[PDB]
Design an enzyme around this catalytic site. Sequence first.
Site, PDB file in Angstrom:
ATOM      1  N   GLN A 254       6.669  -5.692   7.557  1.00 24.75           N
ATOM      2  CA  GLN A 254       7.708  -6.428   6.840  1.00 24.75           C
ATOM      3  C   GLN A 254       8.114  -5.700   5.558  1.00 24.75           C
ATOM      4  O   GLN A 254       9.308  -5.634   5.217  1.00 24.75           O
ATOM      5  CB  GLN A 254       7.233  -7.860   6.582  1.00 24.75           C
ATOM      6  CG  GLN A 254       7.222  -8.676   7.875  1.00 24.75           C
ATOM      7  CD  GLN A 254       6.778 -10.118   7.701  1.00 24.75           C
ATOM      8  OE1 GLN A 254       6.970 -10.942   8.596  1.00 24.75           O
ATOM      9  NE2 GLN A 254       6.179 -10.429   6.557  1.00 24.75           N
TER      10      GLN A 254
ATOM     11  N   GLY B 253      -6.705  -7.778   9.603  1.00 30.83           N
ATOM     12  CA  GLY B 253      -7.587  -7.050  10.500  1.00 30.83           C
ATOM     13  C   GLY B 253      -6.960  -5.761  10.995  1.00 30.83           C
ATOM     14  O   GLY B 253      -7.609  -4.711  11.022  1.00 30.83           O
TER      15      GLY B 253
ATOM     16  N   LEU C  91       5.264  15.612  -1.426  1.00 28.88           N
ATOM     17  CA  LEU C  91       4.099  14.731  -1.463  1.00 28.88           C
ATOM     18  C   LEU C  91       2.919  15.354  -2.202  1.00 28.88           C
ATOM     19  O   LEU C  91       2.129  14.634  -2.825  1.00 28.88           O
ATOM     20  CB  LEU C  91       3.694  14.345  -0.039  1.00 28.88           C
ATOM     21  CG  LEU C  91       4.777  13.616   0.754  1.00 28.88           C
ATOM     22  CD1 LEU C  91       4.262  13.209   2.127  1.00 28.88           C
ATOM     23  CD2 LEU C  91       5.272  12.408  -0.027  1.00 28.88           C
TER      24      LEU C  91
ATOM     25  N   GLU D 127       3.072  16.979  -4.884  1.00 29.92           N
ATOM     26  CA  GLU D 127       3.300  16.775  -6.308  1.00 29.92           C
ATOM     27  C   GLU D 127       2.729  15.454  -6.801  1.00 29.92           C
ATOM     28  O   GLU D 127       2.323  15.358  -7.960  1.00 29.92           O
ATOM     29  CB  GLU D 127       4.789  16.870  -6.627  1.00 29.92           C
ATOM     30  CG  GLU D 127       5.056  17.419  -8.016  1.00 29.92           C
ATOM     31  CD  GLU D 127       6.481  17.880  -8.199  1.00 29.92           C
ATOM     32  OE1 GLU D 127       6.973  18.638  -7.336  1.00 29.92           O
ATOM     33  OE2 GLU D 127       7.101  17.505  -9.218  1.00 29.92           O
TER      34      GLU D 127
HETATM   35  N1  LIG Z   1       3.392  -8.640  -0.028  1.00 31.02           N
HETATM   36  C1  LIG Z   1       3.218  -9.000   1.241  1.00 31.02           C
HETATM   37  N2  LIG Z   1       1.956  -9.310   1.703  1.00 31.02           N
HETATM   38  C2  LIG Z   1       1.777  -9.677   2.995  1.00 31.02           C
HETATM   39  C3  LIG Z   1       2.851  -9.748   3.867  1.00 31.02           C
HETATM   40  N3  LIG Z   1       2.385 -10.137   5.076  1.00 31.02           N
HETATM   41  C4  LIG Z   1       1.044 -10.309   4.984  1.00 31.02           C
HETATM   42  N4  LIG Z   1       0.660 -10.040   3.696  1.00 31.02           N
HETATM   43  C5  LIG Z   1      -0.705 -10.064   3.147  1.00 31.02           C
HETATM   44  O1  LIG Z   1      -1.529  -9.357   4.054  1.00 31.02           O
HETATM   45  C6  LIG Z   1      -2.800  -9.957   4.172  1.00 31.02           C
HETATM   46  C7  LIG Z   1      -3.007 -10.346   5.630  1.00 31.02           C
HETATM   47  O2  LIG Z   1      -2.850  -9.189   6.421  1.00 31.02           O
HETATM   48  P1  LIG Z   1      -1.717  -9.070   7.554  1.00 31.02           P
HETATM   49  O3  LIG Z   1      -0.817  -7.880   7.314  1.00 31.02           O
HETATM   50  O4  LIG Z   1      -0.909 -10.346   7.609  1.00 31.02           O
HETATM   51  O5  LIG Z   1      -2.596  -8.940   8.903  1.00 31.02           O
HETATM   52  P2  LIG Z   1      -2.380  -7.781  10.004  1.00 31.02           P
HETATM   53  O6  LIG Z   1      -2.248  -6.421   9.359  1.00 31.02           O
HETATM   54  O7  LIG Z   1      -1.162  -8.103  10.836  1.00 31.02           O
HETATM   55  O8  LIG Z   1      -3.715  -7.833  10.912  1.00 31.02           O
HETATM   56  P3  LIG Z   1      -4.094  -9.086  11.849  1.00 31.02           P
HETATM   57  O9  LIG Z   1      -5.307  -9.793  11.295  1.00 31.02           O
HETATM   58  O10 LIG Z   1      -4.421  -8.574  13.231  1.00 31.02           O
HETATM   59  O11 LIG Z   1      -2.921 -10.040  11.911  1.00 31.02           O
HETATM   60  C8  LIG Z   1      -2.777 -11.162   3.256  1.00 31.02           C
HETATM   61  O12 LIG Z   1      -3.316 -10.761   2.021  1.00 31.02           O
HETATM   62  C9  LIG Z   1      -1.307 -11.452   3.088  1.00 31.02           C
HETATM   63  O13 LIG Z   1      -1.083 -12.079   1.851  1.00 31.02           O
HETATM   64  C10 LIG Z   1       4.126  -9.439   3.409  1.00 31.02           C
HETATM   65  O14 LIG Z   1       5.086  -9.499   4.174  1.00 31.02           O
HETATM   66  N5  LIG Z   1       4.304  -9.065   2.092  1.00 31.02           N
END
Ligand SMILES: Nc1nc2c(ncn2[C@@H]2O[C@H](COP(=O)(O)OP(=O)(O)OP(=O)(O)O)[C@@H](O)[C@H]2O)c(=O)[nH]1
Lengths: 420, 437, 54, 347
Positions: B15, B144, B252, B254
Amino acid sequence: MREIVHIQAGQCGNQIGAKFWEVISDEHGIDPTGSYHGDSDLQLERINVYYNEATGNKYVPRAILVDLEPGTMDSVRSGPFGQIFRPDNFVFGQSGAGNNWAKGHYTEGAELVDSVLDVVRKESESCDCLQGFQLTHSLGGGTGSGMGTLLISKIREEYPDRIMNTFSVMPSPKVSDTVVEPYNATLSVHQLVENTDETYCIDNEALYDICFRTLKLTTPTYGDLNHLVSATMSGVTTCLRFPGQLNADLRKLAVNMVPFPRLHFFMPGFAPLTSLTVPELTQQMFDSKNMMAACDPRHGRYLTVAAIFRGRMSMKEVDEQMLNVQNKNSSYFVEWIPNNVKTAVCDIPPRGLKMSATFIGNSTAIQELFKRISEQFTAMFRRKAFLHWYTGEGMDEMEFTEAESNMNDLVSEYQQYQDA
Amino acid sequence: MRECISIHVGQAGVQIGNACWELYCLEHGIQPDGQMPSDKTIGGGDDSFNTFFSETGAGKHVPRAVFVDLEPTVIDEVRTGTYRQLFHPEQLITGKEDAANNYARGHYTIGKEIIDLVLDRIRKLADQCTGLQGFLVFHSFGGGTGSGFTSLLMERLSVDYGKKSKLEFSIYPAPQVSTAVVEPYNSILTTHTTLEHSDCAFMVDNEAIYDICRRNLDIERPTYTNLNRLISQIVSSITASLRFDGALNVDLTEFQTNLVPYPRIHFPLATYAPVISAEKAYHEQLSVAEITNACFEPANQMVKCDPRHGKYMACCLLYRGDVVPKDVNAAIATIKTKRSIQFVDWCPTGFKVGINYQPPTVVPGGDLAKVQRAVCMLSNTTAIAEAWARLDHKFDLMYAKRAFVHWYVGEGMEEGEFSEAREDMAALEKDYEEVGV
Amino acid sequence: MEVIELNKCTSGQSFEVILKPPSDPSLEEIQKKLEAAEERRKYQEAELLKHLAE
Amino acid sequence: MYTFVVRDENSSVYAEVSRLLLATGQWKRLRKDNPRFNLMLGERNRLPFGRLGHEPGLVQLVNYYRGADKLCRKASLVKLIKTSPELSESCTWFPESYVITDEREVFLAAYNRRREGREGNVWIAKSSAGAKGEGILISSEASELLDFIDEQGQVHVIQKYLEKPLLLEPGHRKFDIRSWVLVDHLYNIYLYREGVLRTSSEPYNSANFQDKTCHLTNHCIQKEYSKNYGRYEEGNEMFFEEFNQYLMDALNTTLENSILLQIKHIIRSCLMCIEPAISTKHLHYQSFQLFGFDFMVDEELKVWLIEVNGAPACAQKLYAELCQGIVDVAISSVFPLATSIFIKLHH
Ligand SMILES: Nc1nc2c(ncn2[C@@H]2O[C@H](COP(=O)(O)OP(=O)(O)OP(=O)(O)O)[C@@H](O)[C@H]2O)c(=O)[nH]1
Ligand SMILES: COc1cc(OC)c(/C=C/S(=O)(=O)Cc2ccc(OC)c(NCC(=O)O)c2)c(OC)c1
Ligand SMILES: Nc1ncnc2c1ncn2[C@@H]1O[C@H](COP(=O)(O)OP(=O)(O)CP(=O)(O)O)[C@@H](O)[C@H]1O
Ligand SMILES: Nc1nc2c(ncn2[C@@H]2O[C@H](COP(=O)(O)OP(=O)(O)O)[C@@H](O)[C@H]2O)c(=O)[nH]1
Ligand SMILES: [Ca+2]
Ligand SMILES: [Mg+2]
Ligand SMILES: [Mg+2]
Ligand SMILES: [Mg+2]
C-alpha cells in the site's frame, strides 16, 4: 483463508446451531429458501465464508448436522430455516447416546463417525482456501461431548493444518439433565485441551443467571438460553462474515488470542442483553453480569481481549472508552503482554438493535469454571458412583483418573499465569 | 543512468508502494495508462527518471517494481485500481494464504514455497537493466510477511546480487495503528536477520505518522491512506535525487557514504516539514528558516525520540521548491546557535544540502496542502536507539514468559533464534551507547 | 561556516557546509537452515500423528 | 482517576509524595514495571526516558528532567559554567574551579598567580562519588591535593576554598544555605519560601585545615564527628525566620536584601542556561523536578554557588509543606481533581 466448515452435533449442538444459522442468514439477507433478498452488497462480500453458492444463485450453509438420534434433526428440518440446509448433509443414527460420553465417543458414535467424515471431506474438497472447522456442541450429554470430541480428533488427524474452533456449552446443576454431566464434561475438556485452537466457553450457569436476574425471566426455557447463545455466536463471527479493516480469520485470531497452547478457552460477553451509548456498551460488556461463562473476571486477569462494536458510532469514542476501561481496571489485565486488547467496528448492527458490542476474553478466571466441574466430578468419582454406565461401554477407571488429572493441571496453569 | 528496483513486501509495503508510485507518476507527468507526453524519446531513454521507469515501444512507462504478498486481496486492489495498466501482470505476485502475523510462517513454511518465483520475477526486471544500482525494499516490521519473507528475500538478494546496494523503508510498529500482538517478536526477528544484508534503512514509526496526521492535518482518526500519502511524501523526498537531475545522493551507494559511518548503525532519522492541511483555507507560507528549524522539533520526526540527548554522525538536508543556498546557510547558523547539535568527535560538524527547485507535489483531493518549499532532514543520530530500546523492552516482557513462542516453534523455529536475535539487538543498543556519550 | 562543492543544474543545486571539523552466508547455508526448520516441523507433525494413532 | 508508579523506593520526599497521592483517593499505585501510568517517580540512575510518552490515551509525567545531570555533577557543572556563554568563566558567583580535557595544567598557572600575593591559596578537592561526606582534602599546597586526587580512583574538581566565610555568633561558626527549587512542566521556576542553614556546630578555625567539622558543614559529618550537636540551634539547622532576625540584629540588614536576591539570580541563571537542553514543552512526555541548591555566604555578604543536588533530601520540619506544594504545582497541575508557598522566578 476463506471457507469455514460448520458442524453441529447432539441436541444442544443442533439447537444452538440452527438458531445461529437463522440469525446470520437474516443478517446476510438470505431467506428460508436460500435466496438472497438483501439490500446491501456488504451482506454478500464474504458470504462464501459460511455459504456455498449453488445453482440458481441459492446460498446453502456449509454446515453438517450430526446426531445419534433423529428427533432433534427432524425438528430442525421442520423449523423455519430447516429447508435451507443441504439434505444429504444430515447425518444421524437411531440408537442415541443416552447422555453417555462413552457411547458417543467409543461405541455408538464409532459406527457413524466415518459417514460424518465423508460429508466433511466432500464439503472441504469444494473449498478454495479452508480456514478450519467450527463445532457447536454441549459437554454434558453424550453425542455432543463424546462424539463431537471423537470427530474433532479424527478431523485433526485428516486436517492437522486447519484451525479447530468450538462453541462448547458447559453444564451446571442449575440447568441439569442428568447427574453424569460432570463426568461427560471432564472427559470432554481433556479432548478440547488437546485438539482445539479456540473454544468459546458457553456456561449454562451464566446463561441461566442472566436470564433470571437480569432479563427478569422467572422460568428460563432452553430457548431463552439459546437466544443469548445465538446473539453471542453472531457477535463473535461478525468480523469473519463482514468486510472490515481487520480482515479477520480464524488463524490470526488464534495467534493473537492464545499465548500458551493449552490456555485457549475464551469467555464471551455481550451488550446489551436482550430477549445505548458507547460508554454504556463498554461498561456493560466488561461487566460480569454480561459474561457467558459464569466467572468473575475480577477474580483473574485477561491475557488477551478481542472486542467488536456494531452500529453507527464514532470509532474515536470507542477507542477512548476502551482505553478508559483498561485504565480503570488496570489490575485485571496482565502487564507483560503489551497491547493485549484489540477492537474493531462494523457499521452493520444485528437485527433490531442499533448498537451492540461483543467481547472475547482469555481470562484466567475461567479456571473457576473448571474448578466447579472438577469438584462436581470428584464428589462422585471418589465413590465411583454411576461409573458402571461407563465401564459397561468398555472404559476403565484409569481413563477417568487421567481426565481428572488433566483438568486439575489446566486449573493450575491458569493459576500460574494469574500470579504475575 | 543506473536503474533501481523497488520491492514491496506485505500489506504495508504494497500500500505504501501504491502511494509512492502514484506520487512518482504525478511528479514525472506519467498518466495512469503509462503514457508520458513530455517524454520525447520513445521506447527508451537515458534520463534520470528512467532509473525508476522502463519504457515500451508503445511509449508506456512501466515502474521497475515487484509487489509481493502471501495473500492476494491487497495486490488484487492494485490489479483492479487506477494504475492497473501501469504494471505488468507478472510484477504483482501473490499467494493464497498469508503468514498469519507469524514471522516463522513468512520466513520458513509459506515463504520457502514462493522465494524462487519472486527471485525469478526480480531477475526478469534486472535483465532489463544496463546498470543496476540496487533495490529499495518496502515492508512492515510487524506483519508476518513483511518481517519473515522480507528477511528471507534479503538474504537471497545478498547471495544473488552481492555487489548491489539494498535500501530499506521499514514501518516500525505502534499500538495506535497495529494488527498483531506479536509485532514486537517479528520486529526483532527480522531486524536481526536483515541487519547484515541492509546498507541503509529508513524507519517510519506508525505512532509518529499517526500523531502528525492528527495534529497537523486535523484528522481525528487517520486511515492507512492518510498515513501512506504522508509517508509517500517523505519517501519521494528521499528518492527524488535518484529520479531527478542533481548532484547529491545520486546513486544508492551515496546513501551509505553520506549517512552511514558504521555498517550496523544504518538507521537514519527522517524529519519532514511543513505538513499543512489542505482544508485550512487560511495558510501562512513558511520560510526556509522556519522549516529548517522544524527539522529539529521531535514532533516532526518519523520516529519519536530526543536528538538533544544523542550525537550526530551525519546530517543531510533535502529541500524542494523555492530555496536558495543563501537562506539555508543563514538558517543553519541561527539554528546552530539556538539548538543542541553535538556531533561525534570523529566526524565533522557539517550538513550536506540538496535543493530541487520543483516544489513538492500533492495528490489532488488529498489532505496535504500545496506548499512553496519543503525539507526532509536525514540525520544519523544515536537518539534513534530509543526506538530499539522501546521495542526490545516489549519483547522482553513477553519472551520472559515465552508467550506466543509456541506459534513460532510450531512452524520450525527454535527458541534459540529468539535469544540470538535479542542478543544481536542488545549488541546494537550497546553500539549506539558507545558512539553516543 | 565554510561552503564547499557547490553544484548547480536547472533542477536545483547541492552543496556541503562545514561549521566545525572533527576532533555473508552462502546459498548452501540458507537452504540448510530452511530445510532444518522444515525437518523440525515434519518431526512435530509425525509426533502428532503417532499420538493420534495410539 | 490517575495512576502512578514508584521506582525510587528510598527517597523521603517522594515516599511522602506517594503517601499523599494515595491519601487523595484519586491516585492508584501500580507495580514498578506496569507501563500504563500517568506519573513516574523514577530511579536516580538509568531512568528509562526512552520509554515515556508512548502509551496511547495516557498523559505521562516524570519527576526528573532528562539532561539535568549536567547541572548536578561537580565536574559537569564546572564545565557547564566554563563553556556556557550565558554564564562565562567571568561569572562572579561561582568559585574558581578546575576539573582534574584535563585542567591540571591550567590550574597550576592560577596557583602560581596565587603564590605571588600573600592572599590565601587554600583549595578544596571535591568528587561526585563522595556523597557520604568524605573524599575531600583542604590544604594550601597543591602537591598534597594532587597526590590525594591520584590516590582516589574517581574524577575530581578543585575549588577555591572560601577562606573568609560569613561567621555566625555566638560561636564563630560557618554554615551553608539549602534552597529548594521546583521546575514544573511549563518550566516555571518555583523557589520554596523556607530554606535551611546547615551550621558548623564547632567554631571555625583558620589555623588548621584538618579540623574537618568546622570546615565542612554537613548534617551527617556534624552529627558524627562534632562534640556538640544542637547546642546553638536545634538539630544544627537554622531556619529563615531566626536567620533573618539575626541578620537584622547583627548586621542591620534583611535576609531578602543581603542574600536572597543573589540566590534567586543564581537559580535563574543556572536553570535558564540549560532550558533549551532539557525543556519538555514540545516532547511526547512531560518532566518536573525538584532541586536542592547549596550556597555559601562570605564575609562581605556575597553569595556563592557550591553544588546543585537533583535528588535532594528535605528537612524533617518542612517535608509536609513542601511535598504538598509539589503535588499542587507539579502533579495536580497536569492531573486536576476535586497565598502560595513558592516564589515564581520569572523569565
Ligand atoms: N503506515 C502503514 N502501516 C501499515 C499499513 N498496512 C499495515 N501496516 C502496519 O503493518 C503491521 C502489520 O503488518 P502487515 O503489512 O499488515 O502484514 P503483512 O506484511 O501483510 O504479513 P501478514 O501477517 O501475512 O498479513 C502493523 O504494524 C500495521 O500497523 C499501511 O498501509 N501503512
Ligand atoms: C468479538 O468478536 C471478535 C472476533 C474476532 O475474530 C474472529 C476478533 C479479531 C480478529 S483479528 O483477525 O483481528 C485477530 C486478532 C485478535 C485479537 C488481537 O489482539 C488481542 C489481535 N491483535 C491486535 C492487537 O495488537 O491488540 C488480532 C475480534 O477482535 C477485533 C472480535
Ligand atoms: N570552596 C569552598 N569554600 C568553602 N567551603 C566549601 C567550599 N566547597 C565546599 N565547601 C564546604 O563543603 C561542605 C560540603 O560540600 P558539598 O555540599 O559540595 O559536598 P556534598 O555534595 O557531598 C554534601 P551535599 O550535596 O549534601 O551539600 C559545605 O558545607 C561547604 O561549606
Ligand atoms: N444452553 C443449552 N443447553 C442445552 C440445550 N440442550 C441441552 N443442553 C445442555 O446440554 C447437556 C445435555 O446434552 P445434550 O446436548 O442434550 O446431549 P446429546 O444430544 O447427547 O449431545 C446438558 O448440560 C443440557 O443442559 C440447549 O438447547 N441449550
Ligand atoms: Ca524516454
Ligand atoms: Mg438431551
Ligand atoms: Mg497481510
Ligand atoms: Mg551532594
